[PDB]
Amino acid sequence: MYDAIVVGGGFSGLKAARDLTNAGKKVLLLEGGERLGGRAYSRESRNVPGLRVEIGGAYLHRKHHPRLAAELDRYGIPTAAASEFTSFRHRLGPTAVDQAFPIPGSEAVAVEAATYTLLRDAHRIDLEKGLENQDLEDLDIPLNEYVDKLDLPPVSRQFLLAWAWNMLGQPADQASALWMLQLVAAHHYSILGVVLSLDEVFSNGSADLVDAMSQEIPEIRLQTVVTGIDQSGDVVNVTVKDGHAFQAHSVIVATPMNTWRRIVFTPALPERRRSVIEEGHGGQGLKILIHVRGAEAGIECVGDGIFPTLYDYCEVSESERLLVAFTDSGSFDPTDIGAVKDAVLYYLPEVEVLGIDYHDWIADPLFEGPWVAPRVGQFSRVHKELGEPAGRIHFVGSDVSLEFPGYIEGALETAECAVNAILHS
Amino acid sequence: MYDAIVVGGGFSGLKAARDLTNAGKKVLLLEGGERLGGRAYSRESRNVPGLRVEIGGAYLHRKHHPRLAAELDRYGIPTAAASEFTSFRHRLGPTAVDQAFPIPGSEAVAVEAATYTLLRDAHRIDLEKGLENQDLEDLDIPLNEYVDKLDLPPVSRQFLLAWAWNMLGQPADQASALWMLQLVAAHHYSILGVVLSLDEVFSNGSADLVDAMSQEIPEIRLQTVVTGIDQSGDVVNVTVKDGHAFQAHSVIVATPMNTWRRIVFTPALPERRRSVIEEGHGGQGLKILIHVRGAEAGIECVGDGIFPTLYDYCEVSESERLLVAFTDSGSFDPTDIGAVKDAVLYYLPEVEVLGIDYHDWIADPLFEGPWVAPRVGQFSRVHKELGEPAGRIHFVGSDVSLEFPGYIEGALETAECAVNAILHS
Ligand SMILES: Cc1cc2nc3c(=O)[nH]c(=O)nc-3n(C[C@H](O)[C@H](O)[C@H](O)COP(=O)(O)OP(=O)(O)OC[C@H]3O[C@@H](n4cnc5c(N)ncnc54)[C@H](O)[C@@H]3O)c2cc1C
Ligand SMILES: Cc1cc2nc3c(=O)[nH]c(=O)nc-3n(C[C@H](O)[C@H](O)[C@H](O)COP(=O)(O)OP(=O)(O)OC[C@H]3O[C@@H](n4cnc5c(N)ncnc54)[C@H](O)[C@@H]3O)c2cc1C
Numbered sequence: 048m049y050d051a052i053v054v055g056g057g058f059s060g061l062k063a064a065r066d067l068t069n070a071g072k073k074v075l076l077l078e079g080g081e082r083l084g085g086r087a088y089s090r091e092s093r094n095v096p097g098l099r100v101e102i103g104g105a106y107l108h109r110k111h112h113p114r115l116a117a118e119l120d121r122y123g124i125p126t127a128a129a130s131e132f133t134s135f136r137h138r139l140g141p142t143a144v145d146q147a148f149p150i151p152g153s154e155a156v157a158v159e160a161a162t163y164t165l166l167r168d169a170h171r172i173d174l175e176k177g178l179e180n181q182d183l184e185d186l187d188i189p190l191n192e193y194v195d196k197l198d199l200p201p202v203s204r205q206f207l208l209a210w211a212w213n214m215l216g217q218p219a220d221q222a223s224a225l226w227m228l229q230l231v232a233a234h235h236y237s238i239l240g241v242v243l244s245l246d247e248v249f250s251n252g253s254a255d256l257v258d259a260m261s262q263e264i265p266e267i268r269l270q271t272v273v274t275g276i277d278q279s280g281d282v283v284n285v286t287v288k289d290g291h292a293f294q295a296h297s298v299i300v301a302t303p304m305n306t307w308r309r310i311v312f313t314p315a316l317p318e319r320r321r322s323v324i325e326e327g328h329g330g331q332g333l334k335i336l337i338h339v340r341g342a343e344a345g346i347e348c349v350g351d352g353i354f355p356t357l358y359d360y361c362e363v364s365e366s367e368r369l370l371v372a373f374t375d376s377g378s379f380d381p382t383d384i385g386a387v388k389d390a391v392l393y394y395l396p397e398v399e400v401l402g403i404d405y406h407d408w409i410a411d412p413l414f415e416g417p418w419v420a421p422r423v424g425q426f427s428r429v430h431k432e433l434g435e436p437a438g439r440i441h442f443v444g445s446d447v448s449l450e451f452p453g454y455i456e457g458a459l460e461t462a463e464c465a466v467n468a469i470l471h472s
Numbered sequence: 473m474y475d476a477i478v479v480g481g482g483f484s485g486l487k488a489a490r491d492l493t494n495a496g497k498k499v500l501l502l503e504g505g506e507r508l509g510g511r512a513y514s515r516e517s518r519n520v521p522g523l524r525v526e527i528g529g530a531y532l533h534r535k536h537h538p539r540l541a542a543e544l545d546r547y548g549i550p551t552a553a554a555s556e557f558t559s560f561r562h563r564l565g566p567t568a569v570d571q572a573f574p575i576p577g578s579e580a581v582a583v584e585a586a587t588y589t590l591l592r593d594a595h596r597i598d599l600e601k602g603l604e605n606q607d608l609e610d611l612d613i614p615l616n617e618y619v620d621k622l623d624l625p626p627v628s629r630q631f632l633l634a635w636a637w638n639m640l641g642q643p644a645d646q647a648s649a650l651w652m653l654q655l656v657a658a659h660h661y662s663i664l665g666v667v668l669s670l671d672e673v674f675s676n677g678s679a680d681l682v683d684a685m686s687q688e689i690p691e692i693r694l695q696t697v698v699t700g701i702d703q704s705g706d707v708v709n710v711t712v713k714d715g716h717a718f719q720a721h722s723v724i725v726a727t728p729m730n731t732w733r734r735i736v737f738t739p740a741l742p743e744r745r746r747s748v749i750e751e752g753h754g755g756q757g758l759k760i761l762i763h764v765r766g767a768e769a770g771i772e773c774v775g776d777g778i779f780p781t782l783y784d785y786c787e788v789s790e791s792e793r794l795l796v797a798f799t800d801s802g803s804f805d806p807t808d809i810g811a812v813k814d815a816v817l818y819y820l821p822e823v824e825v826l827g828i829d830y831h832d833w834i835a836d837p838l839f840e841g842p843w844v845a846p847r848v849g850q851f852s853r854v855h856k857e858l859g860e861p862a863g864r865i866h867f868v869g870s871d872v873s874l875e876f877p878g879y880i881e882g883a884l885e886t887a888e889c890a891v892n893a894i895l896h897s
């Protein structure tokens with residue numbers, strides 16, 4: 048019997064389990080997989096033997112992510128500034144300029160006006176109240192309709208759409224405008240900031256921080272899949288797939304939102320949460336690492352291709368590199384290499400694709416999705432509650448962070464909040 | 473005896489007198505000077521014999537100025553697109569980029585945030601209510617204080633300040649923030665638009681339109697200075713400096729705001745207007761035409777110099793040009809050529825000043841100022857009323873336009889409005 052059982056060994060669970068430990072509590076961390084880190088997954092490249100790649104969460108920005116920064120400072124984890132872009136190869140039409148900010152002057156007045164509308168709209172969201180408690184329904188519509196209302200000329204329109212596709216992991220017709228404004232809000236009410244937060248990387252991968260953190264957790268069970276969390280008795284009983292149950296005064300669910308439906312909760316969770324939990328969020332982010340020949344360093348491409356963005360990731364040799372493409376799994380099949388060639392050649396006709404590397408987050412039973420993105424209409428029905436305690440069971444993780452959802456920083460923030468709650472209750 | 477006496481032969485009076493005429497009214501136009509056009513003043517250059525220069529109002533933009541556009545269309549007056557800028561020589565510090573929009577990326581987030589604040593603030597102004605009827609007092613503070621609140625990094629801060637100086641004709645400490653926001657509002661709620669409205673010029677000078685218009689006015693008295701307007705009787709009596717009085721059912725005052733205090737009105741004007749009329753507005757715009765050698769075509773300079781802006785105006789020969797500088801008459805003495813050399817050399821150290829040409833609008837008794845700019849605190853006390861009828865006497869002109877003050881378009885709009893009022897009353 049434990050003071051707390053933490054279910055899930057991504058950053059959320061790891062921080063929770065460690066902080067509770069250091070506070071003097073008796074803590075058990077249960078991880079379903081064979082590794083720690085969750086959606087922060089560094090490993091050897093499938094294409095380049097010996098090369099260590101981030102297959103999920105990679106980037107941070109110290110100004111926007113103070114908790115993460117403090118983790119890095121705590122353990123002396125080195126960070127390098129992310130791959131700089133010297134070469135611009137956009138597909139935004141003939142009037143675009145080949146630089147990082149490709150808007151031409153002919154569009155400046157329009158961009159000015161949209162910047163006001165977007166920020167006005169984002170200034171409606173208060174980041175503590177929850178997206179369902181602020182009469183924001185009018186905004187919770189498909190992104191494409193919202194962007195059609197803005198009436199943007201071609202370059203800025205497509206530029207906005209491409210990054211929106213990248214960041215949200217959803218085509219414009221499935222993405223919620225409200226959620227886009229939520230990301231704008233989370234970045235100190237900045238549209239620009241949403242892209243400028245790709246500022247830094249882990250010099251040796253996320254696993255450095257994963258290991259530094261796990262060092263301080265005395266009890267961890269890998270390969271342990273929780274299937275039931277039962278709080279009907281005086282002490283919470285946690286049921287596991289293959290073996291003896293575990294019990295604790297408190298349980299922290301630190302698993303991905305889309306996996307919650309695979310656990311039996313007793314009693315059943317508060318009913319307002321149930322339909323969203325059953326359908327899952329709509330995130331379909333697809334990140335592909337593309338092994339290439341013939342690409343010069345520092346390329347960045349944004350445009351109207353099936354890869355909204357494609358840019359430099361890593362140097363492999365003097366002739367070979369890794370590029371990264373973002374798109375979504377409903378729109379693109381990464382196992383279709385011809386398709387990948389076409390998507391790449393569209394921006395970079397001189398570039399030869401050697402191979403691809405990715406992780407199928409959706410098909411992974413321990414995840415059932417990459418980062419969170421709500422379906423249209425979801426989060427104006429229920430959002431804040433999803434991360435609220437139901438009795439003695441707490442819910443944490445990037446997925447339910449109000450402050451920085453979809454980012455490592457969000458995983459850390461929700462954890463902090465659960466820890467403090469437990470240290471009083 | 474006339475249906476109407478129009479006092480002043482700038483664009484305002486000219487349109488009024490013509491439209492009233494064409495409506496079948498019996499109209500007399502009284503002009504104090506020896507020319508028509510007022511602050512739209514084309515003439516021979518003082519520096520370059522044979523060269524025709526705009527010494528006042530020169531630029532327009534068809535999208536922002538529909539009335540002016542229709543005048544030009546009516547008379548087939550040719551317009552050329554204004555001098556294009558190929559060369560940028562800013563004094564905005566070492567991080568500025570030498571292009572028309574000199575903001576660097578390091579400042580983009582800050583500019584984004586200020587753009588929201590500025591436009592939010594400008595969106596408070598409704599362009600029909602008058603700046604004194606909307607609880608805008610909080611904004612009617614010195615521009616420098618308002619801009620200090622925005623907390624802008626060096627390039628965008630100085631860039632904003634320099635154009636504000638240019639457009640308002642006042643140093644930051646004397647200019648009202650409210651008035652700046654008013655200009656933003658007038659340009660379809662665009663900061664950018666305030667500078668992009670320098671779009672076109674009269675191919676042969678403003679006098680073309682002045683003449684086309686005056687052709688259609690059958691009675692005009694030049695060298696006729698009105699000194700009194702007396703409406704105590706049944707018919708308005710207009711007193712003139714040297715000679716017999718004139719009378720009419722209606723009088724349109726179409727003279728510059730700052731000259732109104734030199735006329736005796738009977739009865740005295742409504743008392744709320746009196747103190748502003750006595751002090752005059754604070755406009756001190758100084759436009760200097762600088763004859764130069766050693767300047768290549770297409771130069772534009774913006775910066776922190778005593779000339780906030782200095783840019784290409786006219787080609788004189790293969791070695792000689794005219795540049796134009798804007799500043800204000802309280803800050804700079806244009807008769808001091810050494811000073812002019814220093815101001816120019818500051819941006820363009822290779823450029824030799826041959827001579828200068830300007831008009832002293834403030835010292836001209838028929839004007840007592842260039843374009844309107846209120847003193848801090850003036851227009852939130854009284855603004856809309858200044859252009860409102862006092863009995864049978866109407867007040868028109870750029871100075872009192874709510875829609876486009878300081879522009880020819882404003883002169884046209886106020887006139888239209890007086891004409892319609894008279895055609896009913
Ligand atoms: C492609 C991609 C790119 C990203 N890039 C960035 C980025 O650049 N910057 C950034 O900040 N973030 C990025 N992220 C987001 C970030 O990686 C995650 O949002 C964050 O790591 C979430 O961590 P977590 O602790 O909330 O949950 P997770 O990391 O998902 O951890 C959940 C853990 O629970 C375990 N689990 C699941 N089911 C059970 C079960 N029933 N029983 C026991 N254990 C179970 C899982 O194995 C997993 O270890 C990216 C994400 C993806 C998918
Ligand atoms: C330096 C400068 C640059 C400018 N640049 C531009 C520009 O680029 N674009 C733009 O749109 N506008 C510009 N303007 C503004 C524009 O020129 C004026 O605001 C506009 O022409 C005002 O015209 P008006 O009809 O209101 O009055 P005015 O043009 O001033 O006409 C008033 C008339 O009344 C006469 N008068 C004065 N007192 C008496 C009296 N007591 N009795 C009889 N008659 C009298 C004067 O002689 C004058 O003819 C500029 C102005 C200046 C000063």
Ligand SMILES: NCCc1ccc(O)c(O)c1
Pocket residue numbers: 106213214215230332373418419452453454
């Ligand atoms: N909700 C944003 C999650 C995210 C994080 C990193 C990325 O590179 C990305 O495209 C999207």
Ligand SMILES: NCCc1ccc(O)c(O)c1
Pocket residue numbers: 531638639640655757798843844877878879
């Ligand atoms: N109130 C703006 C009046 C104005 C008009 C033309 C100019 O060139 C200028 O600097 C200012």
